[PDB]
Amino acid sequence: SQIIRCKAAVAWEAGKPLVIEEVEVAPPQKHEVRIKILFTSLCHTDVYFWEAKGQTPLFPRIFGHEAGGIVESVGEGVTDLQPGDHVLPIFTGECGECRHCHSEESNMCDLLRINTERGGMIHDGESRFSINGKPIYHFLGTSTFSEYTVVHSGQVAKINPDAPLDKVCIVSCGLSTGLGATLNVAKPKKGQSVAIFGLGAVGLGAAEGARIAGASRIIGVDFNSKRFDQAKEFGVTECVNPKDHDKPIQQVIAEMTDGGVDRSVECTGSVQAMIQAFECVHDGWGVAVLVGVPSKDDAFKTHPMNFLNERTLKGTFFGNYKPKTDIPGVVEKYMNKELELEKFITHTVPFSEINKAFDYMLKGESIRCIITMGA
Amino acid sequence: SQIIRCKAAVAWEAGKPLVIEEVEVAPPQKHEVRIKILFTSLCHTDVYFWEAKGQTPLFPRIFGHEAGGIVESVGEGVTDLQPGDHVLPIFTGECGECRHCHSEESNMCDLLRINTERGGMIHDGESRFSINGKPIYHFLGTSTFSEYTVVHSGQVAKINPDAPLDKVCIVSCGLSTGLGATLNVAKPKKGQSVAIFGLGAVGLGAAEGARIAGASRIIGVDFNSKRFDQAKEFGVTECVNPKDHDKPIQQVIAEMTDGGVDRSVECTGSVQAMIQAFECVHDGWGVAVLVGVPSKDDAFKTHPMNFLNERTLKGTFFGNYKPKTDIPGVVEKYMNKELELEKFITHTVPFSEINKAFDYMLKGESIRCIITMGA
Ligand SMILES: NC(=O)c1ccc[n+]([C@@H]2O[C@H](COP(=O)([O-])OP(=O)(O)OC[C@H]3O[C@@H](n4cnc5c(N)ncnc54)[C@H](O)[C@@H]3O)[C@@H](O)[C@H]2O)c1
Numbered sequence: 063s064q065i066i067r068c069k070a071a072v073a074w075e076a077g078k079p080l081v082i083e084e085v086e087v088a089p090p091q092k093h094e095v096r097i098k099i100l101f102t103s104l105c106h107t108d109v110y111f112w113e114a115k116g117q118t119p120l121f122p123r124i125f126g127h128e129a130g131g132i133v134e135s136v137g138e139g140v141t142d143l144q145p146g147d148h149v150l151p152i153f154t155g156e157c158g159e160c161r162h163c164h165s166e167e168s169n170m171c172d173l174l175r176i177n178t179e180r181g182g183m184i185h186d187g188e189s190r191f192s193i194n195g196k197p198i199y200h201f202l203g204t205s206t207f208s209e210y211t212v213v214h215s216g217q218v219a220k221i222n223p224d225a226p227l228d229k230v231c232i233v234s235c236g237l238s239t240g241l242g243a244t245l246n247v248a249k250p251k252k253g254q255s256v257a258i259f260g261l262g263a264v265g266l267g268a269a270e271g272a273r274i275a276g277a278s279r280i281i282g283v284d285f286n287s288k289r290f291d292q293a294k295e296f297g298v299t300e301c302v303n304p305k306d307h308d309k310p311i312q313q314v315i316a317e318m319t320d321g322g323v324d325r326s327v328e329c330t331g332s333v334q335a336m337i338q339a340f341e342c343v344h345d346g347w348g349v350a351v352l353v354g355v356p357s358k359d360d361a362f363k364t365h366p367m368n369f370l371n372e373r374t375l376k377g378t379f380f381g382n383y384k385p386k387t388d389i390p391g392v393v394e395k396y397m398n399k400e401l402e403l404e405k406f407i408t409h410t411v412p413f414s415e416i417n418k419a420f421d422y423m424l425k426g427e428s429i430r431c432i433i434t435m436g437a
Numbered sequence: 438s439q440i441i442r443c444k445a446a447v448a449w450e451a452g453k454p455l456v457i458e459e460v461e462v463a464p465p466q467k468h469e470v471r472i473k474i475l476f477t478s479l480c481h482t483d484v485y486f487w488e489a490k491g492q493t494p495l496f497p498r499i500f501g502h503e504a505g506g507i508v509e510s511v512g513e514g515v516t517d518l519q520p521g522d523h524v525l526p527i528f529t530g531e532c533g534e535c536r537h538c539h540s541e542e543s544n545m546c547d548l549l550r551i552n553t554e555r556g557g558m559i560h561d562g563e564s565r566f567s568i569n570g571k572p573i574y575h576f577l578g579t580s581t582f583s584e585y586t587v588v589h590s591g592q593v594a595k596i597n598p599d600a601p602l603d604k605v606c607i608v609s610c611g612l613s614t615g616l617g618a619t620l621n622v623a624k625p626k627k628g629q630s631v632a633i634f635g636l637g638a639v640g641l642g643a644a645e646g647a648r649i650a651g652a653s654r655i656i657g658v659d660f661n662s663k664r665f666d667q668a669k670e671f672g673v674t675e676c677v678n679p680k681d682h683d684k685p686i687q688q689v690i691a692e693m694t695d696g697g698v699d700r701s702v703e704c705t706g707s708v709q710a711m712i713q714a715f716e717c718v719h720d721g722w723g724v725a726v727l728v729g730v731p732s733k734d735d736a737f738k739t740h741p742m743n744f745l746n747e748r749t750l751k752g753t754f755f756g757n758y759k760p761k762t763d764i765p766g767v768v769e770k771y772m773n774k775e776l777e778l779e780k781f782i783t784h785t786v787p788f789s790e791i792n793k794a795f796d797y798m799l800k801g802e803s804i805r806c807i808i809t810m811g812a
Pocket residue numbers: 105106107110235236239259260261262263264265283284285286289329330331332335353354355378379380381423426428429
């Protein structure tokens with residue numbers, strides 16, 4: 063393997079439109095594999111770092127971590143992948159030899175866990191992308207906004223090759239995160255009630271999951287009332303717009319629910335919402351799960367007696383799925399009609415029109431928009 | 438059943454020496470029981486409300502909520518208890534028919550949960566205590582600093598009659614609170630490491646639980662370095678005093694343990710300790726437990742990524758033990774030589790020297806001082 067010349071959607075500057083550039087993609091080194099991206103979608107996390115809203119801004123940069131693609135070649139030492147394999151890159155990985163990989167509870171691999179500041183590869187600290195000899199930096203070790211990318215093999219999930227990559231690409235971030243937030247972490251019992259603050263693609267995976275758990279009540283909570291109608295299709299039974307109420311939104315919920323919900327799942331990334339997501343669960347057994355990544359440093363607060371009232375609070379990342387281990391299995395779940403994915407997909411654009419995807423999410427019009435390479 | 442005259446140590450005024458008086462104990466009304474008290478000990482919670490540290494001063498009052506005694510009579514409607522049974526009054530009850538009692542998760546009876554303001558019985562708002570026809574108020578529905586007391590049956594754990602009442606009386610508050618915090622909420626795995634903040638009766642219960650639980654490293658955290666020596670008997674392998682460190686205490690623990698403890702237990706009620714207790718645990722699988730009850734209203738505060746890096750925060754009450762159902766069981770553990778309680782009892786005084794117990798505890802000289810009626 064040599065260096066590939068391909069198209070990538072490059073961000074040169076914070077909060078500005080992406081540019082399709084001809085870039086050069088270096089070959090994979092030890093433990094890296096080089097992937098042909100076939101399909102990708104946009105996740106809000108891309109937008110947050112694209113706006114350099116919160117994080118250390120780093121530009122120029124190639125975003126994208128929700129994708130479906132094909133292994134083009136593999137690096138030295140790689141035994142679990144080969145050219146031609148159908149794969150999903152995931153923003154956080156699984157080495158199989160750390161305590162966290164070794165743990166039943168955690169997916170925060172000491173090696174391959176999410177790192178949002180890092181713009182280069184693990185191996186040598188260099189970027190595999192460049193234009194005119196200058197590095198274009200990586201994202202979450204995936205950088206899927208390029209026709210070809212290089213990803214550590216540990217962050218690459220081989221899946222059933224008959225799976226349509228243009229549906230199952232959403233399984234690589236948003237969908238599983240919400241889903242897992244519910245099934246693996248909150249773990250609502252049959253008949254129980256669940257509150258979900260945020261109804262984007264993540265929130266709706268969580269809803270799909272609580273329904274999957276047999277929750278009897280799934281309360282959708284969102285500031286954008288226009289997200290409400292579609293939400294019932296994913297298992298949501300009622301929606302609440304905090305603006306439509308004088309009461310504290312957690313007080314609104316506690317009253318709806320003879321005291322508060324059984325589980326809540328936080329999907330938007332607002333600390334007050336987190337505060338609100340925790341305080342809206344029932345005492346004694348309520349468990350709140352935070353999953354939206356916050357931009358503020360605002361503290362989680364509250365009178366401790368809510369806890370001493372035996373309410374638990376768990377935080378999660380990527381639905382606590384182990385990437386190489388579980389995710390191939392989840393994809394199988396769609397072939398098997400447990401999971402209905404087409405409905406998460408509301409827009410489609412060609413790679414050449416990738417900027418339409420930023421526009422749609424920012425207008426609250428899309429859940430997921432699929433971007434198609436080669437167009 | 439008629440009225441009883443006996444000795445009681447009555448508090449007429451805050452922070453003042455208790456005085457032994459002859460009082461009258463009315464018979465128990467519906468769902469109540471009258472208990473002959475054999476042994477009682479003091480507790481920091483007694484001193485606080487006795488000092489009128491914070492709440493609403495209420496005097497005259499009969500304090501005491503750790504005791505072992507014998508059922509003398511039961512009021513109409515009591516079926517789970519009869520005259521002669523050995524019991525422990527608990528500061529909080531289990532009505533068995535409220536929403537909390539029905540749950541698997543919670544021990545916070547909607548009916549019988551702790552109340553520090555109430556001076557009379559539930560049934561009728563009246564006190565069963567009097568001197569010359571004037572009420573002496575209850576404390577925590579137990580008032581065990583009396584030869585006889587009347588207690589709602591929901592607050593009485595019928596226990597093993599072979600149990601030495603002069604040992605197992607401490608199981609009804611402080612001790613079980615810590616113990617359960619570990620074993621029921623934190624649930625440290627065999628071999629895991631634990632940090633415990635606060636080395637009072639509660640901490641030492643928590644420390645004891647972790648030992649029982651098979652923790653391999655049990656780190657004690659307290660500002661009074663003089664509690665450190667006695668903690669090793671309770672399973673603590675090492676202690677750290679923040680006053681001996683410039684560094685934030687959570688940062689210190691994290692380097693000592695290569696990232697933070699597997700489990701933590703916050704036992705002081707200091708909010709600053711709550712933040713540290715949560716932040717000193719390991720990401721991915723760390724679980725922090727707050728059990729110390731705050732005396733101030735400061736909010737818990739923390740950066741959200743601390744959660745999303747998959748830490749978990751749980752608060753519990755009375756160690757998540759159900760008063761009527763579980764406390765008898767913890768007592769079996771002492772019987773079966775699983776629980777070593779004796780090491781907690783540092784003093785014994787006759788009921789007549791009850792004011793010494795205040796002194797001993799106020800000089801921080803005691804863990805527990807057992808008080809013996811009839812002397
Ligand atoms: N933990 C993970 O591994 C993981 C994976 C994917 C996404 N995320 C993060 O999850 C969050 C959601 O992602 P998404 O793609 O589904 O976003 P999205 O923009 O498509 O949806 C966000 C929803 O939350 C709503 N919202 C915004 N502020 C709110 C507030 N104060 N109160 C209530 N609702 C509010 C918005 O209306 C929006 O509909 C993001 O924060 C993302 O960075 C985390």
